[PDB]
Design a protein around this nucleic acid. Sequence first.
RNA 1: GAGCUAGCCCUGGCCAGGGUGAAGCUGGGGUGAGACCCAGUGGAGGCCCGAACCGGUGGGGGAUGCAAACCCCUCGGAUGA
RNA 2: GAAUGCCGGCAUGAGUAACGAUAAAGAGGGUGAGAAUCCCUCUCGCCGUAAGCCCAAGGGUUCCUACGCAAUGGUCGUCAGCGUAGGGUUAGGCGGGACCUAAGGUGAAGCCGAAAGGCGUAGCCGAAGGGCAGCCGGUUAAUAUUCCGGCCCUUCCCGCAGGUGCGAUGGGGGGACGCUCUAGGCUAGGGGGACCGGAGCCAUGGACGAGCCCGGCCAGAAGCGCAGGGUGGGAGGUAGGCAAAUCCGCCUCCCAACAAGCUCUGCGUGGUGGGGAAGCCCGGGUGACAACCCCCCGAAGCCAGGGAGCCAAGAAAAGCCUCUAAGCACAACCUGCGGGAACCCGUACCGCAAACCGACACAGGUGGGCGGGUGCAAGAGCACUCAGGCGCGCGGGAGAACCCUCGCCAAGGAACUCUGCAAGUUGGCCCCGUAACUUCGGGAGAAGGGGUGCUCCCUGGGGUGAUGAGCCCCGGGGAGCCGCAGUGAACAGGCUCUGGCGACUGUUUACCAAAAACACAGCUCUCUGCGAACUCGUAAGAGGAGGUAUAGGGAGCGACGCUUGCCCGGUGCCGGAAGGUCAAGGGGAGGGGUGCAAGCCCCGAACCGAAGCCCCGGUGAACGGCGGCCGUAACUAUAACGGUCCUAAGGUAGCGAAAUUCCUUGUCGGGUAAGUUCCGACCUGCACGAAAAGCGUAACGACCGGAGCGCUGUCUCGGCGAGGGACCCGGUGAAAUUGAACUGGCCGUGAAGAUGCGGCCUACCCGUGGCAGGACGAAAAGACCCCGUGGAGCUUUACUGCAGCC
RNA 3: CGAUGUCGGCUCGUCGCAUCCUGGGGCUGAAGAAGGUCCCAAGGGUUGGGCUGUUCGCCCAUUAAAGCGGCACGCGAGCUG
RNA 4: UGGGAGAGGGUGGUGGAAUUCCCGGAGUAGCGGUGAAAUGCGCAGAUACCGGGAGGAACGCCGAUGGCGAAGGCAGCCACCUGGUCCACCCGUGACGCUGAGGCGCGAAAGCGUGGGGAGCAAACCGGAUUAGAUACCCGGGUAGUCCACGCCCUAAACG
RNA 5: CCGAGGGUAGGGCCCGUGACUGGGGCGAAGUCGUAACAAGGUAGCUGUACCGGAAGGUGCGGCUGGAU
Lengths: 48, 275
Amino acid sequence: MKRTWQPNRRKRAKTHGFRARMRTPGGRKVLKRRRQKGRWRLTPAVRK
Amino acid sequence: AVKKFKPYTPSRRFMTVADFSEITKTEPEKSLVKPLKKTGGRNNQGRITVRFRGGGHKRLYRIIDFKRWDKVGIPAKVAAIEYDPNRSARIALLHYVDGEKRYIIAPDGLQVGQQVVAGPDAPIQVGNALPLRFIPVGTVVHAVELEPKKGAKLARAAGTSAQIQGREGDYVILRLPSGELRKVHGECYATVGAVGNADHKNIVLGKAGRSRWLGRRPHVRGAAMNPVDHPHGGGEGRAPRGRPPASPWGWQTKGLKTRKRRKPSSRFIIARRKK
RNA sequence: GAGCUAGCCCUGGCCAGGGUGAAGCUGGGGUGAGACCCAGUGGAGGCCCGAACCGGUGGGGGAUGCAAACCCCUCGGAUGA
RNA sequence: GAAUGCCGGCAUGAGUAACGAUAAAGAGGGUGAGAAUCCCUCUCGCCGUAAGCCCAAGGGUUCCUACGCAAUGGUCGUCAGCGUAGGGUUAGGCGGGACCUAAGGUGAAGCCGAAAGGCGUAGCCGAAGGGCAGCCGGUUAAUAUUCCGGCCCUUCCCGCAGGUGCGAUGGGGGGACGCUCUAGGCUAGGGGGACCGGAGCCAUGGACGAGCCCGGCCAGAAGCGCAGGGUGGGAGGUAGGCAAAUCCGCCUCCCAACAAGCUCUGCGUGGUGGGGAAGCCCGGGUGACAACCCCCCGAAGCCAGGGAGCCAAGAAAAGCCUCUAAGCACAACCUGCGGGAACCCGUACCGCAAACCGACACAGGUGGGCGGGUGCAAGAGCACUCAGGCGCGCGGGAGAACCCUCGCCAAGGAACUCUGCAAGUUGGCCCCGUAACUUCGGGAGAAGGGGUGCUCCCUGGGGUGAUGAGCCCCGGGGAGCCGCAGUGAACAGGCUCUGGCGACUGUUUACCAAAAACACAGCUCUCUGCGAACUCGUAAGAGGAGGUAUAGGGAGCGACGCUUGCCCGGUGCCGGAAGGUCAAGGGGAGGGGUGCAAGCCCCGAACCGAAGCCCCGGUGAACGGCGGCCGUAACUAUAACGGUCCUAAGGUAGCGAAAUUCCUUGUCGGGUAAGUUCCGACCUGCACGAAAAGCGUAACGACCGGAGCGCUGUCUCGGCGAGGGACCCGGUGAAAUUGAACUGGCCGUGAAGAUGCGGCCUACCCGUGGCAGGACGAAAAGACCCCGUGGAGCUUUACUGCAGCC
RNA sequence: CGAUGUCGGCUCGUCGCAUCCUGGGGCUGAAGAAGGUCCCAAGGGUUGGGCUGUUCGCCCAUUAAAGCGGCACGCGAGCUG
RNA sequence: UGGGAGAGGGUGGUGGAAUUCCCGGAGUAGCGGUGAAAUGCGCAGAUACCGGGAGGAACGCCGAUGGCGAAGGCAGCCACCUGGUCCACCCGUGACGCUGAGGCGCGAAAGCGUGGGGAGCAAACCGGAUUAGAUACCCGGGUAGUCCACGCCCUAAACG
RNA sequence: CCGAGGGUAGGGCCCGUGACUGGGGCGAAGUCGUAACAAGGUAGCUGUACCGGAAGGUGCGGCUGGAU
Ligand SMILES: [K+]
Ligand SMILES: [Mg+2]
Ligand SMILES: [Mg+2]
Ligand SMILES: [Mg+2]
Ligand SMILES: [Mg+2]
Ligand SMILES: [Mg+2]
Ligand SMILES: [Mg+2]
Ligand SMILES: [Mg+2]
Ligand SMILES: [Mg+2]
Ligand SMILES: [Mg+2]
Ligand SMILES: [Mg+2]
Ligand SMILES: [Mg+2]
Ligand SMILES: [Mg+2]
Ligand SMILES: [Mg+2]
Ligand SMILES: [Mg+2]
Ligand SMILES: [Mg+2]
Ligand SMILES: [Mg+2]
Ligand SMILES: [Mg+2]
Ligand SMILES: [Mg+2]
Ligand SMILES: [Mg+2]
Ligand SMILES: [Mg+2]
Ligand SMILES: [Mg+2]
Ligand SMILES: [Mg+2]
Ligand SMILES: [Mg+2]
Ligand SMILES: [Mg+2]
Ligand SMILES: [Mg+2]
Ligand SMILES: [Mg+2]
Ligand SMILES: [Mg+2]
Ligand SMILES: [Mg+2]
Ligand SMILES: [Mg+2]
Ligand SMILES: [Mg+2]
Ligand SMILES: [Mg+2]
Ligand SMILES: [Mg+2]
Ligand SMILES: [Mg+2]
Ligand SMILES: [Mg+2]
Ligand SMILES: [Mg+2]
Ligand SMILES: [Mg+2]
Ligand SMILES: [Mg+2]
Ligand SMILES: [Mg+2]
Ligand SMILES: [Mg+2]
Ligand SMILES: [Mg+2]
Ligand SMILES: [Mg+2]
Ligand SMILES: [Mg+2]
Ligand SMILES: [Mg+2]
Ligand SMILES: [Mg+2]
Ligand SMILES: [Mg+2]
Ligand SMILES: [Mg+2]
Ligand SMILES: [Mg+2]
Ligand SMILES: [Mg+2]
Ligand SMILES: [Mg+2]
Ligand SMILES: [Mg+2]
Ligand SMILES: [Mg+2]
Ligand SMILES: [Mg+2]
Ligand SMILES: [Mg+2]
Ligand SMILES: [Mg+2]
Ligand SMILES: [Mg+2]
Ligand SMILES: [Mg+2]
Ligand SMILES: [Mg+2]
Ligand SMILES: [Mg+2]
Ligand SMILES: [Mg+2]
Ligand SMILES: [Mg+2]
Ligand SMILES: [Mg+2]
Ligand SMILES: [Mg+2]
Ligand SMILES: [Mg+2]
Ligand SMILES: [Mg+2]
Ligand SMILES: [Mg+2]
Ligand SMILES: [Mg+2]
Ligand SMILES: [Mg+2]
Ligand SMILES: [Mg+2]
Ligand SMILES: [Mg+2]
Ligand SMILES: [Mg+2]
Ligand SMILES: [Mg+2]
Ligand SMILES: [Mg+2]
Ligand SMILES: [Mg+2]
Ligand SMILES: [Mg+2]
Ligand SMILES: [Mg+2]
Ligand SMILES: [Mg+2]
Ligand SMILES: [Mg+2]
Ligand SMILES: [Mg+2]
Ligand SMILES: [Mg+2]
Ligand SMILES: [Mg+2]
Ligand SMILES: [Mg+2]
Ligand SMILES: [Mg+2]
Ligand SMILES: [Mg+2]
Ligand SMILES: [Mg+2]
Ligand SMILES: [Mg+2]
Ligand SMILES: [Mg+2]
Ligand SMILES: [Mg+2]
Ligand SMILES: [Mg+2]
Ligand SMILES: [Mg+2]
Ligand SMILES: [Mg+2]
Ligand SMILES: [Mg+2]
Ligand SMILES: [Mg+2]
Ligand SMILES: [Mg+2]
Ligand SMILES: [Mg+2]
Ligand SMILES: [Mg+2]
Ligand SMILES: [Mg+2]
Ligand SMILES: [Mg+2]
Ligand SMILES: [Mg+2]
Ligand SMILES: [Mg+2]
Ligand SMILES: [Mg+2]
Ligand SMILES: [Mg+2]
Ligand SMILES: [Mg+2]
Ligand SMILES: [Mg+2]
Ligand SMILES: [Mg+2]
Ligand SMILES: [Mg+2]
Ligand SMILES: [Mg+2]
Ligand SMILES: [Mg+2]
Ligand SMILES: [Mg+2]
Ligand SMILES: [Mg+2]
Ligand SMILES: [Mg+2]
Ligand SMILES: [Mg+2]
Ligand SMILES: [Mg+2]
Ligand SMILES: [Mg+2]
Ligand SMILES: [Mg+2]
Ligand SMILES: [Mg+2]
Ligand SMILES: [Mg+2]
Ligand SMILES: [Mg+2]
Ligand SMILES: [Mg+2]
Ligand SMILES: [Mg+2]
Ligand SMILES: [Mg+2]
Ligand SMILES: [Mg+2]
Ligand SMILES: [Mg+2]
Ligand SMILES: [Mg+2]
Ligand SMILES: [Mg+2]
Ligand SMILES: [Mg+2]
Ligand SMILES: [Mg+2]
Ligand SMILES: [Mg+2]
Ligand SMILES: [Mg+2]
Ligand SMILES: [Mg+2]
Ligand SMILES: [Mg+2]
Ligand SMILES: [Mg+2]
Ligand SMILES: [Mg+2]
Ligand SMILES: [Mg+2]
Ligand SMILES: [Mg+2]
Ligand SMILES: [Mg+2]
Ligand SMILES: [Mg+2]
Ligand SMILES: [Mg+2]
Ligand SMILES: [Mg+2]
Ligand SMILES: [Mg+2]
Ligand SMILES: [Mg+2]
Ligand SMILES: [Mg+2]
Ligand SMILES: [Mg+2]
Ligand SMILES: [Mg+2]
Ligand SMILES: [Mg+2]
Ligand SMILES: [Mg+2]
Ligand SMILES: [Mg+2]
Ligand SMILES: [Mg+2]
Ligand SMILES: [Mg+2]
Ligand SMILES: [Mg+2]
Ligand SMILES: [Mg+2]
Ligand SMILES: [Mg+2]
Ligand SMILES: [Mg+2]
Ligand SMILES: [Mg+2]
Ligand SMILES: [Mg+2]
Ligand SMILES: [Mg+2]
Ligand SMILES: [Mg+2]
Ligand SMILES: [Mg+2]
Ligand SMILES: [Mg+2]
Ligand SMILES: [Mg+2]
Ligand SMILES: [Mg+2]
Ligand SMILES: [Mg+2]
Ligand SMILES: [Mg+2]
Ligand SMILES: [Mg+2]
Ligand SMILES: [Mg+2]
Ligand SMILES: [Mg+2]
Ligand SMILES: [Mg+2]
Ligand SMILES: [Mg+2]
Ligand SMILES: [Mg+2]
Ligand SMILES: [Mg+2]
Ligand SMILES: [Mg+2]
Ligand SMILES: [Mg+2]
Ligand SMILES: [Mg+2]
Ligand SMILES: [Mg+2]
Ligand SMILES: [Mg+2]
Ligand SMILES: [Mg+2]
Ligand SMILES: [Mg+2]
Ligand SMILES: [Mg+2]
Ligand SMILES: [Mg+2]
Ligand SMILES: [Mg+2]
Ligand SMILES: [Mg+2]
Ligand SMILES: [Mg+2]
Ligand SMILES: [Mg+2]
Ligand SMILES: [Mg+2]
Ligand SMILES: [Mg+2]
Ligand SMILES: [Mg+2]
Ligand SMILES: [Mg+2]
Ligand SMILES: [Mg+2]
Ligand SMILES: [Mg+2]
Ligand SMILES: [Mg+2]
Ligand SMILES: [Mg+2]
Ligand SMILES: [Mg+2]
Ligand SMILES: [Mg+2]
Ligand SMILES: [Mg+2]
Ligand SMILES: [Mg+2]
Ligand SMILES: [Mg+2]
Ligand SMILES: [Mg+2]
Ligand SMILES: [Mg+2]
Ligand SMILES: [Mg+2]
Ligand SMILES: [Mg+2]
Ligand SMILES: [Mg+2]
Ligand SMILES: [Mg+2]
Ligand SMILES: [Mg+2]
Ligand SMILES: [Mg+2]
Ligand SMILES: [Mg+2]
Ligand SMILES: [Mg+2]
Ligand SMILES: [Mg+2]
Ligand SMILES: [Mg+2]
Ligand SMILES: [Mg+2]
Ligand SMILES: [Mg+2]
Ligand SMILES: [Mg+2]
Ligand SMILES: [Mg+2]
Ligand SMILES: [Mg+2]
Ligand SMILES: [Mg+2]
Ligand SMILES: [Mg+2]
Ligand SMILES: [Mg+2]
Ligand SMILES: [Mg+2]
Ligand SMILES: [Mg+2]
Ligand SMILES: [Mg+2]
Ligand SMILES: [Mg+2]
Ligand SMILES: [Mg+2]
Ligand SMILES: [Mg+2]
Ligand SMILES: [Mg+2]
Ligand SMILES: [Mg+2]
Ligand SMILES: [Mg+2]
Ligand SMILES: [Mg+2]
Ligand SMILES: [Mg+2]
Ligand SMILES: [Mg+2]
Ligand SMILES: [Mg+2]
Ligand SMILES: [Mg+2]
Ligand SMILES: [Mg+2]
Ligand SMILES: [Mg+2]
Ligand SMILES: [Mg+2]
Ligand SMILES: [Mg+2]
Ligand SMILES: [Mg+2]
Ligand SMILES: [Mg+2]
Ligand SMILES: [Mg+2]
Ligand SMILES: [Mg+2]
Ligand SMILES: [Mg+2]
Ligand SMILES: [Mg+2]
Ligand SMILES: [Mg+2]
Ligand SMILES: [Mg+2]
Ligand SMILES: [Mg+2]
Ligand SMILES: [Mg+2]
Ligand SMILES: [Mg+2]
Ligand SMILES: [Mg+2]
Ligand SMILES: [Mg+2]
Ligand SMILES: [Mg+2]
Ligand SMILES: [Mg+2]
Ligand SMILES: [Mg+2]
Ligand SMILES: [Mg+2]
Ligand SMILES: [Mg+2]
Ligand SMILES: [Mg+2]
Ligand SMILES: [Mg+2]
Ligand SMILES: [Mg+2]
Ligand SMILES: [Mg+2]
Ligand SMILES: [Mg+2]
Ligand SMILES: [Mg+2]
Ligand SMILES: [Mg+2]
Ligand SMILES: [Mg+2]
Ligand SMILES: [Mg+2]
Ligand SMILES: [Mg+2]
Ligand SMILES: [Mg+2]
Ligand SMILES: [Mg+2]
Ligand SMILES: [Mg+2]
């Protein structure tokens, strides 16, 4: 049947993207936390 | 004069429609329509604040003139009478001799190709608008301002009307469509005559679908829900209300008055409503 | 977290073919005028049959599956909420 | 040494299940160390509203070529969506941006919030919507509306000519709109041709034919022709379109009017440029100077912003046009012509799937366009088949039980069983014919029945065309032919009678419930006078609603028909400016502490003092409730009648062994040979009853009862047959489970159900196909029950708080 | 209670005997026939239907007869539900 | 042709008396009701009186033993639209008439549907008396209805 | 070809019968009340409506076949 992952690049960028994170206090702490942890990528890769 | 259908389907049994006899023009004045934003009963939070709304036909709002004192002494001609999907009443299109065009709500008996006008010296003739202090006591009247220059607020719905019962100082006394007696300031404008389309209430929707066309989504009973949802929720099998009948939010709903007690307008309401 | 799901908003798209034949309209009869009757025209509808599409009624299979809900047969809706 | 411990390793089950749709394969020839599996050929089968072709999303080199086979591929592999390498994506016109707005988002102004932040007008952003200039062919191993060829077009800059009051982010017009039905004329596409072009063919009995087979076009600027859309002209007045205005709007007047004219689009033609089959021979060459014509069918697409009807009344903004304002009228704009200028990103490949979403090359899911032909009434249905694409990445044998899917069956025909579950039967079209009841539509495809193919003859109407031929579309009549059978294959209702429930179409527990549940039109109560009530929010602010009592909220009931009785003592709500009670505060009789004293300080009665509660009333489609005992009639039996106790009042109409009846299979009647079910009645209703509505109701229902007819492998009662498995051989090779095991029966015993203890009996060692009685077999630390001063959801006249409200 | 699946049916049986029938008997208030009661006896047999989920029971038509119990109210790694 | 009387009918208007309710004033201890009472209302200020307001229904006197209509029926006043009828003149048509099965239309009250309206009245219903009982007569309340619009019903001691 | 009739299916009319049910007629001496006839002790009758063990009552309108 129809499963839960239905990829959509605009959706992905506008939801989890860098600019989305930066707009929100909660978003910025996510970036802060992932940098502190040393994540190679702070944000989901999407080809735009 | 409502139109009926033959029983060629189960819903065409009882379904009735307006006759649309008074209508003379079937597509709106383009300079007087602007888009109506359908809300779905949701506020700027995204939240439903009025349950069971949405999914109705698309509509264009028609800008109505509810402050006819705008143009005192300038007569206008009744160009046409049109359908308005945003209200129960019909609307009338006016060609002012000024060149300007406006919509007003159509009073009962208003005929196309007649002059109407607004102001203190206006004739007491169906369609004209005056301050209440210049309208003869006993005259039925609609689209009444509740405060001077604030706009017509009272008696707007199809078939409705207010009657002037007397005067007292700067104020006149009106019997509202509801039966309430109220003082309204003399300077408040109002249009002589009753609103038209009085057969509006005799329309039988006929099926669930006509409700949906009007933007009315299904209404679910408290009794049909669970305790988490509603006071009437739950019960094993059917159940009487089992407590005083209440809204979803707990307040009682058979008889509990809700008009704020210390409201300043109380000084101006002579007698609460009938029936 | 509403890329699943539920509701709403904005903007687009889709519904083979066949059947029934409402109002109205025209003509004819009727009457003081009417109601109304008959025929023709007409093409209404949460109308009918049935693909696409949307479903999931009954049964069988499957049951370390092809599948963490599937397959076959049958069945519901199909201009409408 | 144990924790269903943790990490790792390796066993068992076992050479076992399985190898992923039953659309299907066989041979020959190549390549190579090696071939059922790679390449080629011939044969065979499958898809063909796709299992073919083109977009979009998502994927991200998977594309092409060479060289490879360790792993990946459910087998193999020389092959590959795999490994290594090199190559491959070309745009002013396609899509997006340098244009416009939609919801929504953001947000100068402004509002609000302890902080973080939330709002918010304009503006800005935001698309699969608006707007905007490219079609046909050729070429590469791989790109092409992009390269090339032909013919077209847009914007910007500058210049020239001609014309004009030029000029705007401002005014106005326009853009600009729904649903259903639908006209005329075209085009897409298709069928036919005895006409035109073609390599060839004559078989096996016949045919050298008016024979078979193949094909008979595509694009195109101006002009022209056909068909459409859009659109009145002039003048005078003018206070409105937030300055102005010659524009627009309004009024008057003349002319024009189903037209014309002007303009815009589609189509045809059109200079020119392309294409071009079968077959033969090696993707190419020939065919070929290829021919490129006639008739018919014909869109849902085009003309298009067409027309009609209807109610539920159907985006915006820019481009474009007009008006003017500052300003400037050496300018500036408009038109035509010329040269110049024209940027950024996408472009490979997959794309109903082995490349996307499902851990897999996974029988699942995935939006848009094209989707040919013949026949069946139509069609995207169904059977076959074109182009095109496939035979589904284990095979070979065998011909057992059993399982799955399928075919048939003597006589019987529901006797099966909880149940006709299942499977038969019926089945399309045309014609005849069709009941109770009904809300007059329906019920209705009721029921039942006749026809249905092919041949010859006669004839009727329509479309095209020309009025005719030809072609095509509907028919009527007569005479015959064949078979068991003519919707000869495929797709295609079994029917009726009678109850319960729900009016109806709808809706629901994604993944055990589709229903009698929810919804529903409709009825009633109730709140709400608008800065409405109500709802979300601390707020601002929103929804309500740019609505105004014929409206909006809440509640119950649930089409319609006929109806909805009595009780207001209690609870709720509603009314009652009195009385009672009543907090902070007012008041300060009268006390207390301290000081030498003024004083400073504390307690404090009466009395005044809100809502709330008390008290007085109202109110049932508000929460709710609607009796007991005893007696009485001239046969008996039974009580219309009476007595008395109690209650706020004692169940009214209708219905009743019921979706409700315990006793119960009540009793009687019907149906049956037989009826705990069903149907109709009776009424001692354990324990119906009137909007948690009462009693009915045509129509409707994948709802739940009962009966009959038809027909059946459901059954008596089983038999045979087909294919896919199961079986044997070659290849690959799991799983849960498992203290170790050298693991028999009886009767006992044992923690009470023993392979394991006792006595006896029986038994050579090891397997394979089978069946499921045991191993208190496996799986899940029982979901029932209890226990825990464990948890959580829910309720209320449990406690105590908080929002909110007074 | 770190699970011993719980009614009934179907299928397949097997055992007990306190015997329903068939065989052998004694007593009889046994004339014959047909019965009654008790004894011996488990070899074989012990029907098809209507109703209900039923076991059971009632009922129809038969019969030599239409037996009663055990096997985890025998039997769901056998089926049904 | 010329005249007359009339509550004949339909439509739109409009007048005063009275009942009830509401606000104000003034005022106190009862009012109401009956055969007698009680229920009921009244110190929360009733009844009675004055002023103001809201609304519905019916039209006193004229009024009669009257008039009009085919019947049912029709009563303030005004206007509009309309029916029948009688009298005068003796002018016109020249038997054009009577009746009338079916048909069609009208048809008091009650009652029904959909809206409205609602003062008074009043089935049902409640309460107080009476009574052996009192599902009545009498008293206090009171809902349909009585009123309007449109549409049905079509009955009657529709009687002379 | 027609054709008696036979068969399948569906209708219409009539008769007989049916648990149970509705009222009706009749029947020497049952029970309850007293509605009508007198102003019948509330004048009666009336069409209709609602109510009530029963006769009846009440509303609305109508008749005198109503006493004084
Ligand atoms: K339990
Ligand atoms: Mg889903
Ligand atoms: Mg997942
Ligand atoms: Mg999605
Ligand atoms: Mg996207
Ligand atoms: Mg996208
Ligand atoms: Mg998105
Ligand atoms: Mg989205
Ligand atoms: Mg976001
Ligand atoms: Mg983002
Ligand atoms: Mg922060
Ligand atoms: Mg920060
Ligand atoms: Mg890095
Ligand atoms: Mg992130
Ligand atoms: Mg109707
Ligand atoms: Mg009708
Ligand atoms: Mg109208
Ligand atoms: Mg109209
Ligand atoms: Mg606009
Ligand atoms: Mg809006
Ligand atoms: Mg917003
Ligand atoms: Mg709400
Ligand atoms: Mg809503
Ligand atoms: Mg309107
Ligand atoms: Mg005011
Ligand atoms: Mg209504
Ligand atoms: Mg609407
Ligand atoms: Mg509603
Ligand atoms: Mg509801
Ligand atoms: Mg509930
Ligand atoms: Mg529930
Ligand atoms: Mg919740
Ligand atoms: Mg709660
Ligand atoms: Mg609650
Ligand atoms: Mg409850
Ligand atoms: Mg419940
Ligand atoms: Mg419930
Ligand atoms: Mg219950
Ligand atoms: Mg209830
Ligand atoms: Mg309760
Ligand atoms: Mg409550
Ligand atoms: Mg509140
Ligand atoms: Mg009020
Ligand atoms: Mg989505
Ligand atoms: Mg459809
Ligand atoms: Mg038909
Ligand atoms: Mg027709
Ligand atoms: Mg028409
Ligand atoms: Mg339909
Ligand atoms: Mg299924
Ligand atoms: Mg089946
Ligand atoms: Mg799952
Ligand atoms: Mg499963
Ligand atoms: Mg399936
Ligand atoms: Mg199928
Ligand atoms: Mg079907
Ligand atoms: Mg259908
Ligand atoms: Mg269809
Ligand atoms: Mg639609
Ligand atoms: Mg240990
Ligand atoms: Mg552990
Ligand atoms: Mg571990
Ligand atoms: Mg491990
Ligand atoms: Mg290791
Ligand atoms: Mg290992
Ligand atoms: Mg091994
Ligand atoms: Mg094994
Ligand atoms: Mg396996
Ligand atoms: Mg498999
Ligand atoms: Mg298949
Ligand atoms: Mg196939
Ligand atoms: Mg071969
Ligand atoms: Mg082969
Ligand atoms: Mg090989
Ligand atoms: Mg090999
Ligand atoms: Mg090959
Ligand atoms: Mg060969
Ligand atoms: Mg095809
Ligand atoms: Mg398709
Ligand atoms: Mg991937
Ligand atoms: Mg390999
Ligand atoms: Mg290999
Ligand atoms: Mg290698
Ligand atoms: Mg591998
Ligand atoms: Mg695989
Ligand atoms: Mg090799
Ligand atoms: Mg490439
Ligand atoms: Mg180009
Ligand atoms: Mg630039
Ligand atoms: Mg804060
Ligand atoms: Mg954006
Ligand atoms: Mg766009
Ligand atoms: Mg649009
Ligand atoms: Mg473009
Ligand atoms: Mg072009
Ligand atoms: Mg350009
Ligand atoms: Mg401009
Ligand atoms: Mg428009
Ligand atoms: Mg518009
Ligand atoms: Mg429509
Ligand atoms: Mg063309
Ligand atoms: Mg064709
Ligand atoms: Mg010929
Ligand atoms: Mg050919
Ligand atoms: Mg051309
Ligand atoms: Mg001007
Ligand atoms: Mg000019
Ligand atoms: Mg050549
Ligand atoms: Mg289309
Ligand atoms: Mg168009
Ligand atoms: Mg149009
Ligand atoms: Mg906008
Ligand atoms: Mg100059
Ligand atoms: Mg110009
Ligand atoms: Mg640039
Ligand atoms: Mg490309
Ligand atoms: Mg593709
Ligand atoms: Mg698919
Ligand atoms: Mg597709
Ligand atoms: Mg592929
Ligand atoms: Mg999966
Ligand atoms: Mg595969
Ligand atoms: Mg073809
Ligand atoms: Mg067909
Ligand atoms: Mg295969
Ligand atoms: Mg396949
Ligand atoms: Mg094999
Ligand atoms: Mg074998
Ligand atoms: Mg198969
Ligand atoms: Mg055979
Ligand atoms: Mg047979
Ligand atoms: Mg049979
Ligand atoms: Mg038979
Ligand atoms: Mg049966
Ligand atoms: Mg059986
Ligand atoms: Mg069943
Ligand atoms: Mg068939
Ligand atoms: Mg019939
Ligand atoms: Mg019948
Ligand atoms: Mg019926
Ligand atoms: Mg009928
Ligand atoms: Mg049909
Ligand atoms: Mg024939
Ligand atoms: Mg033949
Ligand atoms: Mg020819
Ligand atoms: Mg069918
Ligand atoms: Mg029948
Ligand atoms: Mg239901
Ligand atoms: Mg239903
Ligand atoms: Mg019902
Ligand atoms: Mg019903
Ligand atoms: Mg309903
Ligand atoms: Mg319903
Ligand atoms: Mg439907
Ligand atoms: Mg479910
Ligand atoms: Mg669930
Ligand atoms: Mg569930
Ligand atoms: Mg679920
Ligand atoms: Mg689930
Ligand atoms: Mg299921
Ligand atoms: Mg259910
Ligand atoms: Mg269903
Ligand atoms: Mg539900
Ligand atoms: Mg419901
Ligand atoms: Mg109702
Ligand atoms: Mg109400
Ligand atoms: Mg809140
Ligand atoms: Mg608004
Ligand atoms: Mg009826
Ligand atoms: Mg009745
Ligand atoms: Mg009470
Ligand atoms: Mg009370
Ligand atoms: Mg109370
Ligand atoms: Mg001292
Ligand atoms: Mg109570
Ligand atoms: Mg209770
Ligand atoms: Mg009662
Ligand atoms: Mg009653
Ligand atoms: Mg009973
Ligand atoms: Mg019974
Ligand atoms: Mg019942
Ligand atoms: Mg029940
Ligand atoms: Mg009961
Ligand atoms: Mg019991
Ligand atoms: Mg019982
Ligand atoms: Mg029972
Ligand atoms: Mg019985
Ligand atoms: Mg009986
Ligand atoms: Mg019987
Ligand atoms: Mg009894
Ligand atoms: Mg109930
Ligand atoms: Mg029914
Ligand atoms: Mg029915
Ligand atoms: Mg249904
Ligand atoms: Mg159903
Ligand atoms: Mg049966
Ligand atoms: Mg069988
Ligand atoms: Mg076989
Ligand atoms: Mg062997
Ligand atoms: Mg091997
Ligand atoms: Mg392998
Ligand atoms: Mg051991
Ligand atoms: Mg051992
Ligand atoms: Mg052993
Ligand atoms: Mg052994
Ligand atoms: Mg023991
Ligand atoms: Mg033992
Ligand atoms: Mg042993
Ligand atoms: Mg041992
Ligand atoms: Mg031993
Ligand atoms: Mg020992
Ligand atoms: Mg032994
Ligand atoms: Mg073996
Ligand atoms: Mg074995
Ligand atoms: Mg076993
Ligand atoms: Mg077993
Ligand atoms: Mg164990
Ligand atoms: Mg076991
Ligand atoms: Mg076992
Ligand atoms: Mg499990
Ligand atoms: Mg645990
Ligand atoms: Mg446990
Ligand atoms: Mg557990
Ligand atoms: Mg326990
Ligand atoms: Mg405790
Ligand atoms: Mg404890
Ligand atoms: Mg606890
Ligand atoms: Mg829980
Ligand atoms: Mg808790
Ligand atoms: Mg246990
Ligand atoms: Mg365990
Ligand atoms: Mg276990
Ligand atoms: Mg013997
Ligand atoms: Mg024996
Ligand atoms: Mg038992
Ligand atoms: Mg048993
Ligand atoms: Mg029993
Ligand atoms: Mg014998
Ligand atoms: Mg036994
Ligand atoms: Mg036992
Ligand atoms: Mg037991
Ligand atoms: Mg057992
Ligand atoms: Mg089982
Ligand atoms: Mg069992
Ligand atoms: Mg087991
Ligand atoms: Mg076992
Ligand atoms: Mg069950
Ligand atoms: Mg007093
Ligand atoms: Mg006092
Ligand atoms: Mg009033
Ligand atoms: Mg008088
Ligand atoms: Mg004369
Ligand atoms: Mg009448
Ligand atoms: Mg009343
Ligand atoms: Mg009524
Ligand atoms: Mg008289
Ligand atoms: Mg015969
Ligand atoms: Mg007949
Ligand atoms: Mg009688
Ligand atoms: Mg007697
Ligand atoms: Mg008497
Ligand atoms: Mg008396
Ligand atoms: Mg009397
Ligand atoms: Mg009584
Ligand atoms: Mg009475």
